[PDB]
Amino acid sequence: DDPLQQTGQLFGGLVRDIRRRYPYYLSDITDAFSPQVLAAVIFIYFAALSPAITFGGLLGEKTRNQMGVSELLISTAVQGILFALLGAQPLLVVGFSGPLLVFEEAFFSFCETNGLEYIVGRVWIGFWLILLVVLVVAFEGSFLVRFISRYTQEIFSFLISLIFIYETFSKLIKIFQDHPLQKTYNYNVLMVPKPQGPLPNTALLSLVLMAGTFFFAMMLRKFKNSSYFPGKLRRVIGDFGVPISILIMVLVDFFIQDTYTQKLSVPDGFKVSNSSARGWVIHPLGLRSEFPIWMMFASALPALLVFILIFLESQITTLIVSKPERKMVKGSGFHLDLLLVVGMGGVAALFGMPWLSATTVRSVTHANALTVMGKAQIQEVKEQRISGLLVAVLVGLSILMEPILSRIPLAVLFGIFLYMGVTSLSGIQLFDRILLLFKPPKYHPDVPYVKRVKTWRMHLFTGIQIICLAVLWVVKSTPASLALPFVLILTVPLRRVLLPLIFRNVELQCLDADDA
Amino acid sequence: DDPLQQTGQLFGGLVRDIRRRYPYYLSDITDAFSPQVLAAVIFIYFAALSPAITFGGLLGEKTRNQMGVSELLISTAVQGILFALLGAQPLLVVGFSGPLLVFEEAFFSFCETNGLEYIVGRVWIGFWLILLVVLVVAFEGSFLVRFISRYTQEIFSFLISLIFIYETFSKLIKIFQDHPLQKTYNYNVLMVPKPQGPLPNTALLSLVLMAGTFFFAMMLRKFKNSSYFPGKLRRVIGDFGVPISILIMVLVDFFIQDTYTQKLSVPDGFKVSNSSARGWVIHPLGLRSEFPIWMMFASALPALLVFILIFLESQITTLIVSKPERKMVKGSGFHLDLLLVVGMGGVAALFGMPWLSATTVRSVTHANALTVMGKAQIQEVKEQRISGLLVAVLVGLSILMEPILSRIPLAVLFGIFLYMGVTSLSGIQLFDRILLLFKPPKYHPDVPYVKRVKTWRMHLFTGIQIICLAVLWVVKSTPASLALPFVLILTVPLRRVLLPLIFRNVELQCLDADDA
Ligand SMILES: CCCCCCCCCCCCCCCCCC(=O)OC[C@H](COP(=O)([O-])OCC[N+](C)(C)C)OC(=O)CCCCCCCCCCCCCCCCC
Ligand SMILES: CCCCCCCCCCCCCCCCCC(=O)OC[C@H](COP(=O)([O-])OCC[N+](C)(C)C)OC(=O)CCCCCCCCCCCCCCCCC
Ligand SMILES: *[C@@H]1O[C@H](CO)[C@@H](O[C@@H]2O[C@H](CO)[C@@H](O)[C@H](O)[C@H]2NC(C)=O)[C@H](O)[C@H]1NC(C)=O
Ligand SMILES: *[C@@H]1O[C@H](CO)[C@@H](O[C@@H]2O[C@H](CO)[C@@H](O)[C@H](O)[C@H]2NC(C)=O)[C@H](O)[C@H]1NC(C)=O
Ligand SMILES: CC(C)CCC[C@@H](C)[C@H]1CC[C@H]2[C@@H]3CC=C4C[C@@H](O)CC[C@]4(C)[C@H]3CC[C@]12C
Ligand SMILES: CC(C)CCC[C@@H](C)[C@H]1CC[C@H]2[C@@H]3CC=C4C[C@@H](O)CC[C@]4(C)[C@H]3CC[C@]12C
Ligand SMILES: CC(C)CCC[C@@H](C)[C@H]1CC[C@H]2[C@@H]3CC=C4C[C@@H](O)CC[C@]4(C)[C@H]3CC[C@]12C
Ligand SMILES: CC(C)CCC[C@@H](C)[C@H]1CC[C@H]2[C@@H]3CC=C4C[C@@H](O)CC[C@]4(C)[C@H]3CC[C@]12C
Ligand SMILES: CC(C)CCC[C@@H](C)[C@H]1CC[C@H]2[C@@H]3CC=C4C[C@@H](O)CC[C@]4(C)[C@H]3CC[C@]12C
Ligand SMILES: CC(C)CCC[C@@H](C)[C@H]1CC[C@H]2[C@@H]3CC=C4C[C@@H](O)CC[C@]4(C)[C@H]3CC[C@]12C
Ligand SMILES: CC(C)CCC[C@@H](C)[C@H]1CC[C@H]2[C@@H]3CC=C4C[C@@H](O)CC[C@]4(C)[C@H]3CC[C@]12C
Ligand SMILES: CC(C)CCC[C@@H](C)[C@H]1CC[C@H]2[C@@H]3CC=C4C[C@@H](O)CC[C@]4(C)[C@H]3CC[C@]12C
């Protein structure tokens, strides 16, 4: 009963993925009825919205507002609803990511250089993405995901978690750079788009609001595991640990009258970001000028890059989420989820909306938000479709409920991202082994890679993984960032051909195991 | 070998106190040679100086600068040196306290009403205090301290710890009240005594500097108990946990250029605070006017109140510090330490310097700073005279080393007081039982008052102690604050006559035990 197995018939894996999960569909609605699932919806909502506002803004700056916040909120909503209802692993959160923004900036810059319509060029990439995924799913190409071991999974999962933390701290630093601690400030600064000059108390209050939210969140996680108050009340207050932390620090900010803090800013209504540039439906043949015939064929090469990015990101996320370690019983599908994520992305491009991917930190946070703890060991995970569906609906309705969001500071949400980033580093053995570099070999745990293998060998293995982690980081900030998936693919040969001639067969097994 | 035993000969207890401890004098110098003792000196120095600047300032405001910061630094230094060299329990820290400030304000107000010289009136109280202590020590009156049980000790020790925490938070609130978070501030505010108006970033930076110092201090206490880095390095970094926390946040404040923070402010040189009012030596018969003869006899009644305040404060501190629970082997003296503290206080009054007392939180912090931890259980305490002697010398030289202190913010020291206040609530069983009110009865810790006594009876006992704690608090803020020692004395009858008719003899033993 292994999902990653070649049947030997066209669309064999996809049929097996549907036949496996869809018999649980009744359970995937009823199992939602518990207060922990409501606590997950509220937490994952802010986690899911915040990127759609951030990246949506950056897309508006870069692509001359031809694709903006409105487009990304509509895409994240509709794909989120459809995936929650049809998907084989509903705990996956579908949304925009850094590598996709890098491509849109790149493909726009290319279209402006050659004098092409950016938004029409996306429609053709969209058509190729539908053709490629249907071909890959037909011949069962998701069997190749079997070769992606824990080695590549953990390097990837750790890299995203560290960058997510770095990105959160970069936002705090930007406030201090915008609103420095000066002796004298200029009064009557215009604030109609944003504060024109620096302001007093803005940077230090933002620090307090971030630090406050993180503290409260980490304290309420400890309280859940403690032995204070009746057991029933302890779990409920623990389950709602994040949404209590957010409510407190939003009220703290509210009662402070004079000091300025930056709040959430959603679009006016459900409109295209630049009506002069485009509409809702885009004509493949062209809007203003006749779209060239060569690019209608040459759009396969950008479509191949976009496919590889969405595949590697989404399939590695599905492995990390659906590990044997985490108590997942209902099952996962690599063929059905891949067809939906890339298929919807191709159709989305026809309406000028961005294609998305199953993002790691949001997916992991959602799974960690729904998991139960016993005694420390995991008993069960609340595997349903409702938690995913509701977050997608709220992201859709975020424009209508602007009055509520306008009272929420961004500083408060930075504290929640720090909590997400730190909490994501749980099941990653690479993180566990990085902490053993500092511990004496006296107090190291009693795990196989600690008992069976020598300490200096274990550390060398951890060392080679940190070098891989450093090289991937450099590739991601250096302008050659679109060629990360290919550099991440080279982690698979390293593990299978180069490590075996350094380390012994028994050691590689113990250190990198499938089931642990 | 019980210190609190009547011999039946004049100055019997005092001779037994000297004969017991002075044979260890060689050990009380050599046992100082360890890096933990240096870490204690630096921590207890700031803890000892800060009150002498704070109360010294308040004394200057209240007594028309007839007794100020210079007088209190000189007194704390000279009495600190003499007590460290001669005292039977050198871990006691001698300095000014809240109840002594309440008396000086009261006795000044009385002298101004009746038209008497405040500073001369103190000289007579000083002479009575020498007469009373010599009489009490002769007839061995410190045997009465035997009747002060754990019941009264813990109520007292908890009350001082809570007030110390409340006082620390009151100082932070005062900065926000002085420097509110406004939209617009006035520039070119005069800062020659202090900021004349409010300032931007002053209150929020003070909050960050306090919160930062407390965080770092509590993190470095956890690191000491952890299993990270080599054991040798872990203890050294752990022992210097406070002085590392102070150095970090002082450097953080230093590199911030434009923002204002209030720093430590010591006197110019070793001078009397008001030279026009008084000199170094005070003539008992009078300075300007002939001192009245009735007040030379009536000064016995204020001297009796001052004696009771210094006795109750100092002797309860000596019990809490020299408990059987804490590994104290060299021994304590209630007769010798009482003679020194009150005797020096009487002589100090002749030079116009304040009489002091063995303060609880400073004494407890000093003992906790010098105690070793094994595996969690106490192995030993570094009982010496050097740690006490050095802090007294540094408080004396604090005026000369003004350049160093001028760089230290008060906000940083507020974080250190919060750490002291929280950490002081360790051995107090009342605090332990207050936490069990929130825990369910199955998660209780295994101890006699949990196994032998029923849960509802244990909670009633904790309840009656909280009522005693509430009444004492009200008495201390309400203008009748000088009559706290008498209300604290009434805790002894309560425990011995009223509790036995409510609770059973077995229960009172288990809940309130001498050795546990
Ligand atoms: C074991 C881990 C320890 C780590 C602890 C480190 C602290 C972590 C938290 C970071 C700081 C977050 C503080 C946010 C509070 C809101 C402050 C604010 O902006 O209010 C402005 C408000 C604004 O007041 P206002 O605007 O309402 O005033 C009325 C209106 N006017 C001004 C017009 C008259 O000012 C204050 O009065 C705030 C006072 C500070 C109160 C906060 C206490 C901080 C606690 C210190 C740390 C200790 C933690 C607990 C210790 C016990 C644990 C064992
Ligand atoms: C488990 C318990 C969790 C509790 C954690 C809660 C936080 C507790 C600490 C309280 C806040 C203390 C922060 C002090 C930083 C000093 C900032 C400052 O004033 O610098 C001004 C400086 C400016 O100084 P400057 O030198 O650049 O200014 C001069 C230059 N010109 C002239 C151009 C202006 O501002 C900054 O740029 C620094 C901002 C970053 C500060 C750090 C952010 C802290 C957020 C939380 C950290 C998380 C800790 C660990 C998490 C993991 C735990 C598992
Ligand atoms: C709306 O779309 C038009 C069409 O692209 C944008 O017009 C561009 O203006 C920029 C300068 O701001 C020029 O560099 C481009 O050549 C223009 N594009 C074309 C092809 O006309 C306009 O910038 C967009 N406005 C918004 C809302 O961003
Ligand atoms: C120095 O000492 C003199 C003597 O007490 C103080 O003079 C007092 O001045 C206050 C008003 O400030 C009057 O209420 C008192 O009547 C004065 N005292 C007497 C008896 O003359 C003076 O205030 C002190 N200055 C300082 C440094 O505080
Ligand atoms: C205003 C924004 C920033 C925060 C919104 C968070 C809100 C929706 C959260 C914060 C605390 C939450 C409550 C916490 C605890 C409980 C008890 C549970 O048995 C039913 C739900 C209920 C009553 C929650 C409802 C939702 C709630 C009110
Ligand atoms: C979402 C978009 C991209 C999908 C477009 C391709 C369509 C035509 C594909 C996707 C899923 C496919 C079906 C999945 C399952 C089966 C059952 C099998 O016994 C015969 C083939 C059949 C009927 C497949 C062929 C046609 C099908 C509907
Ligand atoms: C309410 C739940 C079920 C769905 C949540 C998403 C909803 C609120 C979103 C998703 C996409 C959105 C639509 C996207 C585009 C348009 C075209 C425009 O000319 C009118 C508004 C309209 C028709 C939007 C209305 C709101 C909408 C339907
Ligand atoms: C992260 C950047 C700075 C690169 C630094 C190299 C790091 C990641 C790795 C590469 C090889 C590693 C070393 C390999 C082998 C040993 C032997 C033994 O004593 C345990 C630690 C030690 C000494 C390792 C420490 C960490 C190490 C130095
Ligand atoms: C005003 C002066 C006396 C106060 C100074 C402290 C007093 C209490 C001290 C200083 C020296 C002390 C005495 C020195 C020597 C002895 C002899 C000894 O066999 C019994 C104790 C006795 C009698 C001491 C106790 C009382 C004493 C007089
Ligand atoms: C500037 C003010 C506010 C803070 C002063 C604190 C200073 C004196 C403290 C902070 C850290 C301390 C050091 C921490 C660790 C060690 C290692 C030990 O084996 C010898 C002492 C030594 C080298 C300490 C010396 C004193 C020290 C430098
Ligand atoms: C090194 C040890 C022994 C002593 C440490 C503290 C020293 C430096 C302190 C304690 C008390 C202080 C003295 C207190 C009072 C006066 C009177 C004044 O008109 C001149 C300074 C003088 C004389 C001070 C000099 C410094 C002093 C002696
Ligand atoms: C501000 C006031 C309330 C402080 C006075 C102390 C309070 C908290 C004390 C006084 C008497 C105490 C109660 C005495 C007896 C019991 C029965 C036990 O089975 C549960 C706890 C309970 C119900 C106690 C709870 C705490 C209590 C109410």
From Swiss-Prot, chains A, B:
Transmembrane intervals = 36-59, 68-88, 92-108, 118-138, 151-173, 203-223, 235-255, 296-316, 333-351, 352-369, 386-406, 407-425
Glycosylation site list: 274
**What's noted about post-translational modification?**
N-glycosylated.
Mainly resides where?
membrane
Q: What effect on the protein does mutating residue 76 to N have, as reported in its record?
A: In DRTA4; decreased expression; decreased stability; no effect on dimerization
Its localization reads:
Cell membrane; Basolateral cell membrane
Instruction: Name the consequence of residue 313 to Q.
Output: Impairs expression at the cell membrane
Q: How is its activity regulated?
A: Phenyl isothiocyanate inhibits anion transport in vitro.
Site (Important for anion-proton cotransport) location in chain: 313
Q: What is the effect of changing residue 189 to M?
A: In WD(a) antigen
Q: Name the job this protein performs.
A: Functions both as a transporter that mediates electroneutral anion exchange across the cell membrane and as a structural protein. Component of the ankyrin-1 complex of the erythrocyte membrane; required for normal flexibility and stability of the erythrocyte membrane and for normal erythrocyte shape via the interactions of its cytoplasmic domain with cytoskeletal proteins, glycolytic enzymes, and hemoglobin. Functions as a transporter that mediates the 1:1 exchange of inorganic anions across the erythrocyte membrane.
- State the name under which the record lists this protein: Band 3 anion transport protein
Instruction: Give the species this sequence originates from.
Output: Homo sapiens
Gene name tied to this protein = SLC4A1
Which part of the complete protein is shown?
A: 369 to 891 of 911
